[PDB]
Hints:
The structure is a homodimer of 133-residue chains. Chain A has 133 residues and is an alpha+beta fold. Helix content of chain A is 27%, strand content 26%. Chain A contains 4 helices and 7 strands. The first copy, chain A, is globular.
Amino acid sequence: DRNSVDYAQIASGIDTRTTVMIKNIPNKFTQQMLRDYIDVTNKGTYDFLYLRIDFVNKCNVGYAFINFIEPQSIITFGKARVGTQWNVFHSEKICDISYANIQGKDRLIEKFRNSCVMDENPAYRPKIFVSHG
Amino acid sequence: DRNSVDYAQIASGIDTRTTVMIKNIPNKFTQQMLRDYIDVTNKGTYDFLYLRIDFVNKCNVGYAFINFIEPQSIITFGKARVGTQWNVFHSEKICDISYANIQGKDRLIEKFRNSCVMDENPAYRPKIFVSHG
């Protein structure tokens, strides 16, 4: 909506935003494969890449943060990848992108440098709630 | 879309789906506060609750899985909470819900019981990529 990506608006110097979400990633992906996936068309063009990893099952959550050094790199990646399928063979999930709310290598670095409280008891680690009966 | 929640369709016995996402949770929330938040109107009515926790900064990711034991409980919670603001005072984020893709306490339990590979090297733990210069 306010965060959907318009190529021509990057091309024309309007939309200077550099942080982007790669969405619909198969739950069955590693950071490394994502790197490799991106580096096919966009090697060297990004400041920051984090494929978000669930604390509990250590799967990815289906999206990643990437900050491109230059906004036009978004066009290179989008044209090449948005629309296409992650794996024509092993997942029906297809790739899409949108601007993140947090923008800029600097804020991204702080997001993940500073841990959050998880509970009032600091000895706690996240425990799913489940019941039976 | 295919997963948006229609109360009257729960009420009428059409939509038997029980797994739901609580969305737009402030990054600044704990599982416990979520439990407490839910238990205000829906104590005792759910099988499964997991507020998704980022492996790296140990923040929540802005959403949680909840499986209600009975589909009408979704109406109780939605009417009470969707639309309202998590914290009228300390976050402009407001609460919304939608059906999850994974449905049912049983599949949810397996999702999080079985760890995923994170890398080909099993000694690896998720490392953000960042560069400067």
